[PDB]
Structure formats: C-alpha cells, structure tokens
Coordinates of C-alpha atoms in Angstrom, one line a residue:
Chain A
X8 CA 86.7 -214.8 -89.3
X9 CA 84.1 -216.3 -90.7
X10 CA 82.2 -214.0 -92.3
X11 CA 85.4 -212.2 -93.9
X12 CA 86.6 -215.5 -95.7
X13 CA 83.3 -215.3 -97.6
X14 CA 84.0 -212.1 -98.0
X15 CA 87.6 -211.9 -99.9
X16 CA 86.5 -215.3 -101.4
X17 CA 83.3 -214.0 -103.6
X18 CA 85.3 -210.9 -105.4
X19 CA 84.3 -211.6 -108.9
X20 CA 81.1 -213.0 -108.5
X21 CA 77.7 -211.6 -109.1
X22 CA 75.2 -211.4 -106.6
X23 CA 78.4 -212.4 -104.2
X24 CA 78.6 -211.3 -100.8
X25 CA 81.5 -209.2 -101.8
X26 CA 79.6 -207.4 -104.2
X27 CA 76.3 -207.4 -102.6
X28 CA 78.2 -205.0 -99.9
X29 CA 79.9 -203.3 -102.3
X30 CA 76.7 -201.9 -104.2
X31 CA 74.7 -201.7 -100.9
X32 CA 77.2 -199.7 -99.0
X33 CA 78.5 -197.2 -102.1
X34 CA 74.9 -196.3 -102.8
X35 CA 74.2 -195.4 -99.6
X36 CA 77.4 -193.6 -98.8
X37 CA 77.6 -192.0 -102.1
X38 CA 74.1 -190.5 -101.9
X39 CA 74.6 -189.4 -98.7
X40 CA 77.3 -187.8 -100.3
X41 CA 75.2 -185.8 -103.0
X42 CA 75.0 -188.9 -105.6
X43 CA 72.0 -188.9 -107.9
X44 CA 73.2 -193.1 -109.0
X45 CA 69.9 -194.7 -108.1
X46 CA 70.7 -198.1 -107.4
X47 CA 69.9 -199.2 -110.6
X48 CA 72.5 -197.3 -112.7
X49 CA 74.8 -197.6 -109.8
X50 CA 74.7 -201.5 -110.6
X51 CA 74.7 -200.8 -114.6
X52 CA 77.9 -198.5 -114.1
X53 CA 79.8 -201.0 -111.8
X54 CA 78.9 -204.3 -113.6
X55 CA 79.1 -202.9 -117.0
X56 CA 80.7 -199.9 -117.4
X57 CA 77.5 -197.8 -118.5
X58 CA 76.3 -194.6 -117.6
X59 CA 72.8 -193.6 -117.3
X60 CA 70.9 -190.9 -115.6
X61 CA 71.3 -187.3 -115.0
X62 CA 74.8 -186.6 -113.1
X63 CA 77.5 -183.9 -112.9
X64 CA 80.5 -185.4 -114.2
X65 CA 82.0 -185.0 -110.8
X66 CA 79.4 -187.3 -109.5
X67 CA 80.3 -189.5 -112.6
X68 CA 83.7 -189.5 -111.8
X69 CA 83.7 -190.1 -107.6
X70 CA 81.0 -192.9 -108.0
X71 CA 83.8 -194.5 -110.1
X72 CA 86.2 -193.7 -107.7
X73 CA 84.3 -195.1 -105.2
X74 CA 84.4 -198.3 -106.3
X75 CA 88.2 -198.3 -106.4
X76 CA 88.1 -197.2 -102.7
X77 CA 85.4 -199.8 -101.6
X78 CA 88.4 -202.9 -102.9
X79 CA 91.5 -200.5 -101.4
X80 CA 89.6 -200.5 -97.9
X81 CA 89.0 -204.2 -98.5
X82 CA 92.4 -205.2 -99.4
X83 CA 93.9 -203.1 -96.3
X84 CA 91.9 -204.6 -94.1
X85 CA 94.0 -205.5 -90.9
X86 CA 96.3 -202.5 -91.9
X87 CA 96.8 -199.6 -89.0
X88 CA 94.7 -196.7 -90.5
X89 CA 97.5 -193.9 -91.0
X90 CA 97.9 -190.9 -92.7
X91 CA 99.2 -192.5 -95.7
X92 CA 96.2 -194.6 -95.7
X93 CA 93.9 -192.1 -95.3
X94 CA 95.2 -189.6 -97.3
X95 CA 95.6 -192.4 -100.0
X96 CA 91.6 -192.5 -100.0
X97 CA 90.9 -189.2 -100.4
X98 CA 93.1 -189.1 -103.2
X99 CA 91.6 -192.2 -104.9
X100 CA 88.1 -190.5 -103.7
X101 CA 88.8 -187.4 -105.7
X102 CA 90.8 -188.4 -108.7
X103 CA 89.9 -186.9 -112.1
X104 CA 87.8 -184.0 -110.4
X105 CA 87.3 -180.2 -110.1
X106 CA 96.1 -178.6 -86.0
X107 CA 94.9 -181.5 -88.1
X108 CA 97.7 -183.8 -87.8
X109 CA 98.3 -183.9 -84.2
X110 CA 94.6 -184.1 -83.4
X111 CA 94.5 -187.0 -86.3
X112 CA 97.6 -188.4 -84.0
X113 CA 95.7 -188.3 -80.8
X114 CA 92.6 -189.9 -82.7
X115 CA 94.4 -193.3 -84.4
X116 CA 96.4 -193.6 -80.8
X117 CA 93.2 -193.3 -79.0
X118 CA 91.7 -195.9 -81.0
X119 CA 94.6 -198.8 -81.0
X120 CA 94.8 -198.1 -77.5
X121 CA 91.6 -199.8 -76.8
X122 CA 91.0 -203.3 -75.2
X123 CA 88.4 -203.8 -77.4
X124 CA 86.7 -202.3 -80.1
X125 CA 83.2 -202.1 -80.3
X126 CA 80.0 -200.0 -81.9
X127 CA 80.5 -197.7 -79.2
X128 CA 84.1 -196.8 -79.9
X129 CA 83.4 -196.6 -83.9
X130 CA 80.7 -193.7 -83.8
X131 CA 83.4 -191.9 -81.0
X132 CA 86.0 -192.9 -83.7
X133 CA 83.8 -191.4 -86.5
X134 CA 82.3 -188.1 -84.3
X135 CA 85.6 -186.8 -83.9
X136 CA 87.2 -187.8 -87.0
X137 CA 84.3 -185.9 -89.2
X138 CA 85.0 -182.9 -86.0
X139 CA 88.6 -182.6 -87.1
X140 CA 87.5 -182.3 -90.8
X141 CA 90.8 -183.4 -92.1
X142 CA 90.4 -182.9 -95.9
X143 CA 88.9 -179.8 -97.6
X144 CA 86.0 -182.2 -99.2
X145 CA 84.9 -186.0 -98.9
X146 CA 85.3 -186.3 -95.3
X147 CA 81.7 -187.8 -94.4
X148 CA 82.5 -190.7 -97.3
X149 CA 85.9 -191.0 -96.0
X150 CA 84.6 -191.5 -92.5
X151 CA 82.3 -194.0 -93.5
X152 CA 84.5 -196.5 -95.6
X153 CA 86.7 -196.0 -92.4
X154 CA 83.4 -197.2 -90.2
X155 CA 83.2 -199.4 -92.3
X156 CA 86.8 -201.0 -92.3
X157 CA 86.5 -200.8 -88.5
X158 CA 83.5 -203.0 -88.5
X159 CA 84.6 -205.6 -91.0
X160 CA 88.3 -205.8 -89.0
X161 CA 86.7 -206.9 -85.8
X162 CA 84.2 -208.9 -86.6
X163 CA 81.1 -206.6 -85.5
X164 CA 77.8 -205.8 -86.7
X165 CA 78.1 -204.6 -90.1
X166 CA 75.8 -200.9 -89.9
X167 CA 75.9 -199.4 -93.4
X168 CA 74.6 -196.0 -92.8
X169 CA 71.7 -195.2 -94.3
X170 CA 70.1 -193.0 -97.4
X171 CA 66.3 -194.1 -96.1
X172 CA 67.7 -192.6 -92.8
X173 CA 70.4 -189.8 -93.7
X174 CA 68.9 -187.1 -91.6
X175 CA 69.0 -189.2 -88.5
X176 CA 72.6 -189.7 -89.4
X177 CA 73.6 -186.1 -89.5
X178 CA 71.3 -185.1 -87.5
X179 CA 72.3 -187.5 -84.7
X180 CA 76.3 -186.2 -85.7
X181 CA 75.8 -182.7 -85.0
X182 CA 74.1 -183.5 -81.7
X183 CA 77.1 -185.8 -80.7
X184 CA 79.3 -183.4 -78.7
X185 CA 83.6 -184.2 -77.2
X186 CA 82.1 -186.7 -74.6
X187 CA 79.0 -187.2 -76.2
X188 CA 78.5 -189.8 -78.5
X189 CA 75.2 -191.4 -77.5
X190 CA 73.2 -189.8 -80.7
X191 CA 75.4 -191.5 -82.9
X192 CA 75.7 -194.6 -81.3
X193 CA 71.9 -195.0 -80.9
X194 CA 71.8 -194.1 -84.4
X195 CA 74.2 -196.8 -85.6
X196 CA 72.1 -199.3 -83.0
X197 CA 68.8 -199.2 -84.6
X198 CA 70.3 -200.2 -88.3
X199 CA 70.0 -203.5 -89.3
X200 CA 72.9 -205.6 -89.1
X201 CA 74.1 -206.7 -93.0
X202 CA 75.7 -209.9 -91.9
X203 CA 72.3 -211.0 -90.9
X204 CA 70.4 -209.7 -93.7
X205 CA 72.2 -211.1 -96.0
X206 CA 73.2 -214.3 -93.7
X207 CA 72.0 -216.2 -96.9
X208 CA 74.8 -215.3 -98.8
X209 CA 77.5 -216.5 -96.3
X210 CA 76.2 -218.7 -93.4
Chain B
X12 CA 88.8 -161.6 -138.6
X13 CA 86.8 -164.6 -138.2
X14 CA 89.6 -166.2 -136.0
X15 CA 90.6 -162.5 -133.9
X16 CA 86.4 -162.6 -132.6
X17 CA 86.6 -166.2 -132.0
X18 CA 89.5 -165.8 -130.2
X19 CA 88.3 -162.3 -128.6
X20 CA 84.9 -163.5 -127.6
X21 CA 85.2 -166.9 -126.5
X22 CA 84.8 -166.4 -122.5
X23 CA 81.1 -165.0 -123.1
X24 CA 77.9 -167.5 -122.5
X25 CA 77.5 -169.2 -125.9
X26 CA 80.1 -167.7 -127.6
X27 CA 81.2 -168.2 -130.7
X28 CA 84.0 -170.1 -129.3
X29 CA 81.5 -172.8 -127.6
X30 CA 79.1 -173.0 -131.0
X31 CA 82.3 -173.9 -132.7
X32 CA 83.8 -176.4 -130.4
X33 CA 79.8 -178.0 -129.5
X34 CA 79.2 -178.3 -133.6
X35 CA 83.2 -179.3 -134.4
X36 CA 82.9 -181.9 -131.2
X37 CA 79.0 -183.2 -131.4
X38 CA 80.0 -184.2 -135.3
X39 CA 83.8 -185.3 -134.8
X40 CA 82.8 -187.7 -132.0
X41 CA 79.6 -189.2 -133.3
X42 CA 81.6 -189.6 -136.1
X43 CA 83.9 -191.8 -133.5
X44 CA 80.9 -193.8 -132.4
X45 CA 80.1 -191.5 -129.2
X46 CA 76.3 -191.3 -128.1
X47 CA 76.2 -188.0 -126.8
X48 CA 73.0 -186.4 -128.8
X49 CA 73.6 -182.6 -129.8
X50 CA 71.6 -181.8 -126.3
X51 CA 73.7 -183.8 -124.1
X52 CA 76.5 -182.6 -125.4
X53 CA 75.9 -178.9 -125.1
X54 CA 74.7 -180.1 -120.9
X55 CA 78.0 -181.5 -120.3
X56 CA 80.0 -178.4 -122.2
X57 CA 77.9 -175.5 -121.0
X58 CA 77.3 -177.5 -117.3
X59 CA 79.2 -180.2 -116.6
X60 CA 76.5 -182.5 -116.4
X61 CA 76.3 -186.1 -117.8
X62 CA 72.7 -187.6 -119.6
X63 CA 72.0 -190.0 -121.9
X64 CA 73.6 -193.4 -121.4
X65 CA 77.1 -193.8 -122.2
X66 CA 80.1 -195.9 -122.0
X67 CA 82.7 -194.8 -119.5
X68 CA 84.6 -194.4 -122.0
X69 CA 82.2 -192.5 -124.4
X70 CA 81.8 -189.7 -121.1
X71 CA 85.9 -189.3 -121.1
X72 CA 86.3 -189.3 -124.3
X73 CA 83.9 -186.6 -124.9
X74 CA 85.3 -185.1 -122.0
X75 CA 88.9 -185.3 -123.4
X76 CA 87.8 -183.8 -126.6
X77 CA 86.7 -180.7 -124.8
X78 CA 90.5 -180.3 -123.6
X79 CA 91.7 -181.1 -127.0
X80 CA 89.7 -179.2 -128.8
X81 CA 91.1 -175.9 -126.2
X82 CA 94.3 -177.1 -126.7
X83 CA 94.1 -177.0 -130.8
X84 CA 92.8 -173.7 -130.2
X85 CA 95.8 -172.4 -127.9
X86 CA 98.3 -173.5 -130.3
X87 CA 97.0 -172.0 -133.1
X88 CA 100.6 -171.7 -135.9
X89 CA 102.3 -173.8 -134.0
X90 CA 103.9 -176.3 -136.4
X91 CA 102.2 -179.9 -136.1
X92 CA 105.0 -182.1 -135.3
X93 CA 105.6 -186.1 -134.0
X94 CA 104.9 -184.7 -131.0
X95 CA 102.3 -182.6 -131.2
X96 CA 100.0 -185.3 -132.6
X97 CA 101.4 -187.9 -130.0
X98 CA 100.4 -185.2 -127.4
X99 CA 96.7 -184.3 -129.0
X100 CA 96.3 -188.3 -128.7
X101 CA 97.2 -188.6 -125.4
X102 CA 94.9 -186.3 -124.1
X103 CA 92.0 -188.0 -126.0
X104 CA 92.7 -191.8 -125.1
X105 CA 93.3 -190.0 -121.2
X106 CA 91.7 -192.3 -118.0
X107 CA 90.3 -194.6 -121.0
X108 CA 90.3 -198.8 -121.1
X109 CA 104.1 -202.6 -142.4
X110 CA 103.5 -200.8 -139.0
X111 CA 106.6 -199.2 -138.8
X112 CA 106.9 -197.3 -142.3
X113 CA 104.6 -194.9 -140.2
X114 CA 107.3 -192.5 -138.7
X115 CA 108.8 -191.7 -141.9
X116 CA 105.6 -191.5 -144.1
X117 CA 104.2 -189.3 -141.4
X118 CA 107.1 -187.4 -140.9
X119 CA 107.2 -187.0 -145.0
X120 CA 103.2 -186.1 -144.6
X121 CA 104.1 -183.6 -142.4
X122 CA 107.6 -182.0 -144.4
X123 CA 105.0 -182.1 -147.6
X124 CA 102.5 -179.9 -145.6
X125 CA 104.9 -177.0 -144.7
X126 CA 106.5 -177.3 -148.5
X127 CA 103.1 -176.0 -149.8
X128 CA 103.4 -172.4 -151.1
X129 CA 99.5 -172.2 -150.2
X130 CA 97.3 -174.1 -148.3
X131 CA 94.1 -174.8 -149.7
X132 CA 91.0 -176.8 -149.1
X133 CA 92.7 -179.4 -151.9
X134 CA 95.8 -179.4 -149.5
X135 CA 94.1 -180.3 -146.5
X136 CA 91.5 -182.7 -148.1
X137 CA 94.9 -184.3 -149.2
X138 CA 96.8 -184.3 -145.6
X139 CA 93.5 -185.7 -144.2
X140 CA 93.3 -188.6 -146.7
X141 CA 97.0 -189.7 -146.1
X142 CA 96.6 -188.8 -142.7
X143 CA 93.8 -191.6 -142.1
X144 CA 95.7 -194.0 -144.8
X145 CA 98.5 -194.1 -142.6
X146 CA 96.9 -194.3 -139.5
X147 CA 99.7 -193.8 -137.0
X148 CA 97.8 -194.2 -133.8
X149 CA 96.1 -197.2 -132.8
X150 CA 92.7 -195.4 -132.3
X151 CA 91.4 -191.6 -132.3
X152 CA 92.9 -191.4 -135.9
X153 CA 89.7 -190.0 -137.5
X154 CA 89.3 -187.7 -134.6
X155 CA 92.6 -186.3 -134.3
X156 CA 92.7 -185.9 -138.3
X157 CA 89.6 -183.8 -137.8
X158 CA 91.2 -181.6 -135.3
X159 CA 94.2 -181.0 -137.7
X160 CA 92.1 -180.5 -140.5
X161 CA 90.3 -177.7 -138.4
X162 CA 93.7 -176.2 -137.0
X163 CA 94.5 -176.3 -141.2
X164 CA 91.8 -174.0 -141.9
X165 CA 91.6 -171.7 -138.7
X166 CA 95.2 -170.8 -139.7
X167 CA 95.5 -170.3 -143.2
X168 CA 91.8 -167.7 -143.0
X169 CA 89.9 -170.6 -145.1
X170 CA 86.3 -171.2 -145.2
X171 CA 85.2 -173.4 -141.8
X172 CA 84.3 -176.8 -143.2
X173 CA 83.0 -179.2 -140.5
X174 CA 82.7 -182.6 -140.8
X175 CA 79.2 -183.9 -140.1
X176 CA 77.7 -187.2 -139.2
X177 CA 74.6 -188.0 -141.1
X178 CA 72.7 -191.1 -141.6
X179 CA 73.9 -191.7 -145.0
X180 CA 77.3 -192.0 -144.3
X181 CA 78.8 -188.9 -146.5
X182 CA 82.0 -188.6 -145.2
X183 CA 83.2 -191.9 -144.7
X184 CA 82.0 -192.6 -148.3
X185 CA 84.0 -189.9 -149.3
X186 CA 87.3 -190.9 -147.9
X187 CA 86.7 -194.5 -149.3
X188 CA 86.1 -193.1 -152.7
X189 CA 89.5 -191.0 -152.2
X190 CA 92.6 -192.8 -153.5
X191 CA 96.4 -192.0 -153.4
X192 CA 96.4 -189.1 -156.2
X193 CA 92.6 -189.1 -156.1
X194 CA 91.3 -186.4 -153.4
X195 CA 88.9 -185.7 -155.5
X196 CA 86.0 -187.5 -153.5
X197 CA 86.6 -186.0 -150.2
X198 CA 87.6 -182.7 -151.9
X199 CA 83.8 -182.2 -153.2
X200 CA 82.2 -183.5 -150.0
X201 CA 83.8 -180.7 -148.1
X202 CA 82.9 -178.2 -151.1
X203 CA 79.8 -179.1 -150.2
X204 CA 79.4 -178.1 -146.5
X205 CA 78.7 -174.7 -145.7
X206 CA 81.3 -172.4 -143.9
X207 CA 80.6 -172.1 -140.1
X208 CA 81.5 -168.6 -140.7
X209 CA 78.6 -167.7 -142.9
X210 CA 75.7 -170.2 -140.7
X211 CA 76.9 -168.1 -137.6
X212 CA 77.2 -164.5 -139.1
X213 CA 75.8 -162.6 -136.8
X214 CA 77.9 -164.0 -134.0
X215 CA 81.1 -162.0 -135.5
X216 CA 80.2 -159.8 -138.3
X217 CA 77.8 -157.7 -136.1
X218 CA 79.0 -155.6 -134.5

C-alpha cells in the first residue's frame, strides 16, 4: 500500500501528506456540515491552537473534535467498522457540546460480504447508511470519515466530497433511492482523485 | 435585597444576573490574560458564539468561568471548604492543556474566616491577600480568589466591589503593595471602586 505508507509515515509533518488530507478533507466535511472555519483559520486552529473568526462554540468545539476523529479513523484503518467503532466517533464527534441496529447489521454484513470493494459499493455503503440515520445528529460527517476510511482501506481513488460542490452532493443523496445509487456514484465519479492531486507529495 | 432581585430576576434577557456575571467575568479573566474584549464576551454569554482570536484555551476558560461563576452563585452560604475550592478549580482548568505548608495554612485561612464576628471589606481584602500569597493551586489562583472574594460580599449584604483590569495595572499593584499585616493597599484600591449595586440601580431598586 503504497500510498498509505506515506500516509501513516508523514503524521507530524507540515505540508505532509498526512496533514495535507487532514485539513483538505475536515474543511470540506465540516462545512458541509454547517462550519464557518474557512480554511485559513481551520489551519491556524489545527497547527496552532488559535481561534479566529465568527463561530458558535459548538462549531468551535466539533471542528476540534474533528481533528481527533480524522487520526481515530486513521489509526483504525484495517479495523471491521462496528458499532463500537462507530458509535465511538459520534461520541468523539460531539464531545463537549449542547430498527437502527439490525438495519446497521444488515449494512456492515452487506458490505464485508463483497468480493471487492469499489466506488460503486462506497456511495451504496454511504446512501443507506445516511437512510438509516443512526444517530440523532452528525450522521452526514460520520458517513463521510466512514467514506473515507473505506477509500483509504482499499486502495481506491481518494474522493473528498466537496464544499465547491455540496449541493450536487445532497442533491445527488436524496435522488439516490434502495436500488438506486447511480446519483451518488456519478457524483463521487466526477471529483478529482487526491492521490493524484497531490501525487507530489507521495509518488 | 440586592441579592433576593439578583437571584429573582436572573432568567430575564440582560438581567441583572448576566450584567453581573459579564462585568465580574470580562474583568476577572482579562485580569488572567484572556482576550475576549467586553463585546465578545457578552456574544459568547448572551449567544454562544465565539469572535475575536483566541487560544483554545482562552475560549474554555472563558467558557468554564461561565459555569463557575453559576455555580458560586448556586452555593451562595455554603461554607468554602478544601473541597469547594478544589471543585471551583476543576471546573475552570476543565478540557484545558515549601509547597506543602499549603493544606494547613489554607485550611487555617479558611478556620480564621468563619472565626470573624463580622465580615468586612477589611476581612475579605485580607482572605484575598493570603489567599493569592499561598497560592494553593497551580494556576486560576487570581481567578478563583476573585470568585470567593465575590461569594464574600454577595453573602454578608456588602457593597459589590469588582475587580477591574485597566491599563495601569491597579490591582495587581495593589496586592504587591499588600504585605502580611499590611492590607492596607488592596483595602483602599477596592474603597475605591464603585458598588455594582449603585452603577446598576435601576436594574433592582425600580420597581
């Protein structure tokens, strides 16, 4: 895995691989999310510890948290996603803040069950994970670090959805239907692939 | 009286209550090195919303001293104790980043307060210097000595005194000028605040 060794091997470097996907991938998914971190201050707050802006202190808070859940899904990667895992992020996600389970079940068996996995079965993976709505809150940013997890585990194109294309994301969600995942997947498609974006930082 | 309205009134939109706690905490914590302007401050009371730039540890600190602050508030002649100040520092250092004559001097600091037939502004100008001299905690020791000297007066009906930063220094100077047996420094600095309760009059004596 080539582009993982660089990966787990650039942790505390700047302008690293590691932390060039960190800050592009947590602004995104954060604003998505509702975060007003441009990514600026999202840099000054996770390479120095300083706020700046206008935020809600939840905002402050879960953009911090973020950052802890960004390493967690990096150090678990090659762990089966479970409940304890994923209930262990939302936690982590909303620390310091103001029939799921079988259909959860059916979900993670569904996935480890396949040959192979591919951009095809992460959106499906995704579509009716974020359809299930496990958790009362967090569920899109939950979703995504799980995307993103899936993508890293198995060696495919890394797509970091987008905040320059957020609508097309939950647009393209909403049109996805049970059996009907080609919004999302042609979504997911047209992003850039950040291993090869970034290819100068790792190959 | 002063204390029944504060009390009585605190859940309406700027309350008494909040002008209390937003001039008590805006002072206490710049006092501490926080950045939070008087503006900012009253955002992230009044709205939970963060501006400015800040430290992490600035934004829970201020945060914490919101909770503190509540809590000196709710336990209004309860006795301070070890634990009660262990407790109150807690809270503040919460989701953050010889020395052992302490226990017994504080614990004589504290048997010499409740000895007193009357407390007075000279009593609790005295607490607070011995208080910081001894400096039990590693840090939040100015802060939490402001919050007790504000539980001292809330409770005995005394004149509200608070604390202010300016950009001469005052109160700092004062302490420094104080001297075991010598109060009289920080004594006259606080003489010469005015009482909260008379700047905010027509928040309580209205009606």
């Amino acid at each position: 895995n080539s582009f993982l060794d660089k990966l787990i091997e650039t942790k505390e470097l700047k302008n690293s691989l590691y932390n060039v996907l960190k800050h592009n991938f947590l602004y995104h998914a954060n604003k998505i999310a509702g975060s007003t971190f441009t990514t600026e201050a999202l840099a000054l707050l996770l390479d120095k510890n300083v706020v700046t802006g206008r935020h809600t202190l939840d905002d402050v808070q879960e953009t911090v948290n973020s950052s802890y859940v960004f390493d967690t899904v990096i150090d678990s990667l090659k762990e089966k996603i479970t409940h304890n895992f994923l209930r262990n992020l939302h936690s982590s996600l909303i620390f310091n803040t103001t029939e799921v389970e079988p259909k959860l079940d059916e979900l993670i068996e569904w996935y480890y069950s396949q040959s192979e996995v591919s951009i095809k079965v992460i959106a499906e993976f995704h579509y009716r994970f974020e359809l299930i709505h496990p958790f009362q809150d967090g569920n899109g940013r939950i979703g995504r670090f799980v995307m993103l997890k899936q993508m890293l585990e198995n060696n495919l194109p890394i797509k970091i959805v987008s905040w320059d294309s957020e609508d097309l994301y939950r647009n393209s969600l909403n049109s996805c239907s049970l059996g009907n995942y080609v919004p999302l997947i042609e979504y997911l498609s047209s992003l850039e692939d950040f291993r090869e974006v970034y290819k100068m930082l790792w190959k």
